[PDB]
C-alpha cells in the first residue's frame, strides 16, 4: 500500500543506495564476481550466470562506458590512478575525467575515499566545487567525468607570476569562500594546498580532488595539531585555516613559510612556529598580510576561523576596490586564460607514466567495494 | 541519449529479468549469501554487508511477507510444499497461497518449474486460469498468492457425484477451451488430470498447478518422463519429442473418468497401467453399464488413438466442431457465462468444505560461497 510507494520513493532518492543505478551495479557486480569457469562448477552459479548472460551483454552496451569517450590527453597522475582531457563522442562535449585503479585501492587497503568525493561533487551545488556530471565503472576502474578546469592550477599560476598582493587578496578570498562552502556541507578538507584549486575558463576558484575530506561530527600546508594526531588526536575546521595562512604566504613570498629540503626539517619547523616563521627582509608585503598571515599561523585554540568565518571576512587586508564577498566571483579574474581550443591543456604539465586482479579459485568479491558508484546526472 | 531511454524501458516492463523487483531479490539474496561469520573474514564481504545492513532491514520490513497473512487452513500438499488458505491481515482478503521449499528444490535437482508456473498465473490474464496476485519469497521459501477457488477440485467432484452426460459435457468443453488458452500462449501442459482442474464461487473450471508445463519450441514440439500414469499418453510413455496433442489423449482419458467412474487403462499394478495404455486400440473397452452415447464413445476415441491421427493434431476447431459437445443450454463463446451443474453452497470467505483434510531442513551454514538463493532470484512479483 503505502509500504510500495515508500519502497519506490527510496529507489527513486539519487542519494538512495538502493537507486536503479546502484541496483544495475549490484547485478554487474555480482556477475564480474561469479562469472570464472572455477565458480561455475557450482550450479547454482552456473545456471544463474546462463539465465543472465544475453540481459548483462545488453545493459554493458547501453550503459555508459569508457569507450563512449576519446582520451585526448593525460593531464593528471595521482595515488591511485590518472585524470584525463576527454571528449564524450556523441554530445562532443569536453570533460576531465578522473580515474581510480580497483586492484590498487583494494590492495593498498583504501577503498572508501571516492565516496566523499562523489558525492562532495555530486551535490555540492556550488561554483566553488567542480561539477560532476557521470560517475561509473569497468570491472578495472571508476571513472568520475567532471567539468574540466582549463585554467590549471594555483601551483601553476604562482611559478608563471610574480603574485602582487591585490590578485593574493582575490585568489584568498575565493579560497576562504570555498572553504567554508565545504564547511556548511559538514565536512573538513584535510589537505588544503594549491595543488587542490583549479582555475576555471573564466580564472575563478574552483575545488577538486576531495580525496581526504573527512565528515564532522605533503608537509608543507599540514597543521601542527594534525602533525601531533597522526602519532590519538583529533581537530576541526580550524585546520584549513592554517593552510590558508601557509597559502598566502607562499603566494606573497615565493617560498613555503616552514620550507626545509627534507620533510622531516619542515615538520620540526611547523611544530616550531612560533620561533620558526619569519617574514623575509627582501619581501614586499603589507603589516595587514603578514597580520593575517600570522593570524592563521598560531595554535589551533587561538585560530582565526575557529568563530567562524566572520572574522576572517571582517579582517582589513581584504579591504578593496574591486569587490565585495557576496560577487567575488561575478567580479573579473586577475588572470582569465587565453585559451585557443576546447582541448587546450597550455596550463596542465606534462605527464610520463598495470595488474589486474588475479582469476580467484574462489568467491572473493572485489566488485562488492564499489557497488553503488554509478551516478548519472 | 536514447539508449538511457532503452535501459529505462528494460527496468520498467514486468516482463524483465532486470525489473526493479528483480534488481532488489539480487540485492537481498546477495547479503543472505554473503551473511554468514566464515564469509566476513573476507574484509570486502564485511564492508559491503555493513554499508548495505541498515537499507536491506528497512527493504525486508516494507517488502511483502508470510507474516503479512494469516494463515486459516493447508488445504493442499504437493511434492515441493503445500498450499494454504490464507487472510491478508490488513486487507483482509482470502487468497490461496502456495509454498515451495528452496531447499526441497535445489536438493531435489528441480529449481525451475516454478517461472513457467508464475508467467502463466501472473500473465495469461485469462478466466481459465488462476490469477496470481503476489510472488514473494523468503530465504526458506518460494510464495505464490493466488485466488481461492473455494469449489474444490474434479477429483472431489467425481467422488461426490454420479456425473451425467450434461455435467460431462460441460466440463469437457471448459477444460478444452482452458487447454486452448494454454496452447496459445505457445505452452504444452504435460499434466492434465482431475487433480489440476479447480472450480471457482460459481462452479466454472479454472487451470492451477502448472509445474509440468513447457515452453513449446517455434515448430510446437517440445524435449525426461513426467506424470501420474493413468492420464499419460503412449508417446510421452515411449519418450523423445512431442506436441500439443499429448494434453488431447488426456482430456479423452478424462471423459472417460467422468462418465465411465474408473479410468479407461486402470490396472492394479503400474506396468499393468503402462501395458494397456501402450496396447490403447486393443485395450479401449467401454463396460456394459456404463452410462454414456454414441458421440460420447466416439470422442474418447477420437482423443485416445496414436498421435499421429489423434483429435487435435489440427487445432481445436475440430474438437469444437464434435457432435457430442451439441446441446440446448450454451455455445463455445458464452460457455462460462451460463449456469454451471454445481455451484459450490459456501458458508463464509474462508469455507474449505469441498478441500480434503491433510495429514523439514534448511541449507546448512556455508564454509564458502555457495549462492543458494541465486536460482530465484526474479521470483519476486506484485501485481
Ligand atoms: C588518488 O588518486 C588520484 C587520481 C588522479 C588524480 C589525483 C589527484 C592528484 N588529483 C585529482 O584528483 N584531481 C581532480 C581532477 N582535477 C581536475 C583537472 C581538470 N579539471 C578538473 C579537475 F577536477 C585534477 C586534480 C588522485
Ligand atoms: C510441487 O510443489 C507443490 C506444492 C504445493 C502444491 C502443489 C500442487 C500439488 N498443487 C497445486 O499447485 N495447486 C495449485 C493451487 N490450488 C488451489 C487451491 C485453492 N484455490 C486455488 C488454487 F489455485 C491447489 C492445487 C505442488
Known sequence: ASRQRKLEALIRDPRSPINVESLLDGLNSLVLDLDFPALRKNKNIDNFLNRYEKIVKKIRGLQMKAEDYDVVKVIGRGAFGEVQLVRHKASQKVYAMKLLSKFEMIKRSDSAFFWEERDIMAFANSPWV??????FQDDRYLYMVMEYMPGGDLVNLMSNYDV?????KFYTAEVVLALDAIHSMGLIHRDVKPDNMLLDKHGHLKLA?????????TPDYISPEVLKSQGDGFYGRECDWWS???????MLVGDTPFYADSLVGTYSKIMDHKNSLCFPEDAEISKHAKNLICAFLTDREVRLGRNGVEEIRQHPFFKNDQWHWDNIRETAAPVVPELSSDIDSSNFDDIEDVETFPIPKAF????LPFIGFTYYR
Open 209 to 217: 580532488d576531495f580525496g581526504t575530506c573527512m565528515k564532522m561530527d
Open 244 to 250: 590558508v595562512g601557509v597559502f598566502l604566504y607562499e
Open 364 to 367: 572473493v568479491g572485489n566488485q
Open 130 to 135: 567542480v561539477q560532476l556530471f557521470y560517475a
Open 164 to 168: 602582487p598582493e591585490k590578485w593574493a
